[PDB]
Design a protein around this nucleic acid. Sequence first.
RNA 1: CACUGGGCCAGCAUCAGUUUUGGUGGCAGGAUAAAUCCAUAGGAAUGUAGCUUGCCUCGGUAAGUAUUAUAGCCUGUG
RNA 2: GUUCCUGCCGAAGUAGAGUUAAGGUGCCGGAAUACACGCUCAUCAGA
Lengths: 88, 530, 78, 183
Amino acid sequence: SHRLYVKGKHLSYQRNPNVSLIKIEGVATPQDAQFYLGKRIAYVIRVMWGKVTRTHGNSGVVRATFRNNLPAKTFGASVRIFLYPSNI
Amino acid sequence: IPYDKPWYEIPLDPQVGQNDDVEELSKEQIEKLFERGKQTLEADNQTYYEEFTKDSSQAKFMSQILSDGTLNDKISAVTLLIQDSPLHNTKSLETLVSYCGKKSRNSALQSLNALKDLFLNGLLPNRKLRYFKNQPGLSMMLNKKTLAIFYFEDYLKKLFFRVLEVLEVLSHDPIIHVRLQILNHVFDLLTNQPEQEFNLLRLGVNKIGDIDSKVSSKASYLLLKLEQAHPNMKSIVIDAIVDIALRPNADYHTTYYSVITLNQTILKRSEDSVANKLVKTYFTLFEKFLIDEKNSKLFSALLTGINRAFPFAQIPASVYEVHMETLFKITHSSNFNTSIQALVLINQVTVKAKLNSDRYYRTLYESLFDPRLVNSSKQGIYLNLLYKSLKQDALNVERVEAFVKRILQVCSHWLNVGTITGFFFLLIQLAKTVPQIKNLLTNWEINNFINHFHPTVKTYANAYVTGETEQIAKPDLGLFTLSHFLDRFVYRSAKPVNTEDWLTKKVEDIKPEDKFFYQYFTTKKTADGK
Amino acid sequence: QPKIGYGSNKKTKFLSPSGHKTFLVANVKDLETLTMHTKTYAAEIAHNISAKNRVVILARAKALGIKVTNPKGRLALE
Amino acid sequence: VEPVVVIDGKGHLVGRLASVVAKQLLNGQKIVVVRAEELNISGEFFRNKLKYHDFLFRAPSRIFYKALRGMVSHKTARGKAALERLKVFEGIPPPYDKKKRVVVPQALRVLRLKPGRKYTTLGKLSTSVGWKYEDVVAKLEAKRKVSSAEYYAKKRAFTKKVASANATAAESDVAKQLAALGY
RNA sequence: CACUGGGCCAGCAUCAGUUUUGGUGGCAGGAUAAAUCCAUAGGAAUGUAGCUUGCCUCGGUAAGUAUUAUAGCCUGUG
RNA sequence: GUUCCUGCCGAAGUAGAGUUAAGGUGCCGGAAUACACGCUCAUCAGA
Ligand SMILES: [Mg+2]
Ligand SMILES: [Mg+2]
Ligand SMILES: [Mg+2]
Ligand SMILES: [Mg+2]
Ligand SMILES: [Mg+2]
Ligand SMILES: [Mg+2]
Ligand SMILES: [Mg+2]
């Protein structure tokens, strides 16, 4: 294995196509999600890059902003969240 | 009466089943039994309804729908009330028929669709319905249970008849959609149930003469489907169609669509009576209308029908002889599509009657120079007719050679490739039956076709000259046509040319039509096979 | 729904994506009014000009170094 | 957490199970439903009967499919995709008969519906509305239960073997030294 | 072929505005918190320690005084 | 009957970020199928 990231699901838009809601595995609380803020998101061949902005709700869903908005057909699509830029 | 079983399958009294020699009950005796059958029907079925009302959850929730619900919800609730116990709930059956009769087209259609589903769920018998006076074993000794059943059968027959009335009034509705839906329901009932088949067929075939061409076409299609589903009613359907086409007030639209429908019927080698009906009907209509553009189409259809039915028809040849001159009058008519079929009929009659046939061959040799033939869609029928005629005339070597020469003359100035390949294939085959035709190549036009732009035409001509016939499939119309060439040439047919790999295809195996494609692909490499 | 809040910024208003304000031109004399304002303005030949005049306007515009918004119009299609 | 999740239909409510499954499908998870004939609905038998009627597909699986499609925006591209992701079956057809099947606690009837409240079994409803296959499925289910009893015996033997193996690993040193040191 | 300056893009650093989220430091007030803790006399029961009586499965059982004893507790109160 | 588009004054706006009222947190739909109490499932249950 060579995985240095966690593959997460893209849920939906903020309801605003600019903001996207990302569900990340093993994150039940906003406190757990606070770690992932600022990390780079990559939807994968072509790749679109973005970043995690802030938490969303009590379930651990987070907000995300990409350089170009997702096409809205990727709700439930697999998305990667890397560890850099690390704050630890 | 039990509710767990369809009320036809409920066992009747035994006395019904061995009483065929019973004296004819007087009308009063039938009336009293009919009344006694009635009172027993609106008897305990009420007690069943009283038992139904005991379930307060069931009664209240449905009564709310039957009182306050929408029309769709009420239609559903009434339909179920009939499915659960059709015999007991005459009130809901009457209610359902009452929705069919309103002024609201959408709801009336919905209610009638619900009734159609109820009828076509097997609720109606495999057999037809019987009136109370016509029931078997109708006697004074019959029990209340069977007597109520017979009364309900009479009531349901009247129900079906009033439903047919509602169909008839709605079938003439101005809105095209309403008429089409009513037609669909009528033909569904006619196909799947036997009750009032004559009246249902009468309405359906009556809609052939509808003002709207769409309704007429739908009726014709549904009638042809009905014939295919039940070949045995083919004679009845044909008789019904004849009953309208021959009316004094038939109207050109109605008779035209009726002749189309009769033409599209299918005939078998044991149906001489039906074919003998159809040929006589066509001739009667032909004399009716002969005695122009609108006329040309009707004559085209009538000639098509007579040609279709001339095989399978055991009619004396003298009948056709009466119209023979008239048929020739068509051959010089304005619409060449009529002349093709007229020539077909003339050839068939001449062959079967063994007439001298010089005049027919004269008219064919003439019609080869008809300019309208070049732009005629029916060139394939003309090709087949030419082949059959020339095959039948093998003895007159000079005449057939003259046709071959003129055929090539006409072909030199045509644009339709499929027709030209057709003539070349015919000439190749006529050479086999008549080898003396090859003498013309040794004793001039063929040089042009050898230099024809179309590769397939060139290959056919080369084969005819060389005599190499084994590599020729019979040319098929719809192939070599321009739209087909575009479909290949755009490389996207999908029931593609690029998908097949042309690097490895045997050169002789490759059809002449696609040779240029092959070259490009074997030059392109790259996206040769995808 | 249109309203004033949608109004575009003044510095960017009336600007093509090339960054040149479009100015209608009828003849050479009107072209020459845009001699130095090549950065700020680009010429646009009017619809009613004949083909013979358009080539002259294009030649003079090239000499002046002024961008033409619709060249090859009525000398080519689209 | 798995490529595919097999959910048993027994003892579940149609609405809650359908909502949960629809939510999972919209997130891309693939779910297949089996043994839907024995699904449950709250209320009385008549009320559900007339509800399915005023709708009037007779099979229980189709009723569940409608209930779930009511959640998803099927007319959109996304809803259609969620719908092909779904699978529904009456009884367990192959090959899922050889795979263990999870339970959704949120839709369980035992945890949701209060004792002494009328409910309805979807199989009875489907049979009453005209689904003439409840009989064949029951015999297949009985055979499946016999096979499952055999599998349970095999699993008990496997658990005994696992206990023996765990005992064997216990008397090895390296694991004990590792646990004391860390982890 | 090598280096350097401009422009586009991606990242980082150091700043500015706006807010969001933590961790942690210092200080004032209260009845200078009130508790607790250690003291502390008096009092009680949800009555310990024991004694006594009846009967006793020969170790537990039943309740009369019993205010601390082989448990503890509440008030005043430093 | 209505009265091209935009703006303005007045009885009785566009975009980004954050906060918040009214509301809402089963799914469509963004938010706990969170907690803690008292109730009620009625043939008019109750949205
Ligand atoms: Mg113009
Ligand atoms: Mg800052
Ligand atoms: Mg302090
Ligand atoms: Mg202090
Ligand atoms: Mg104290
Ligand atoms: Mg003190
Ligand atoms: Mg704002």
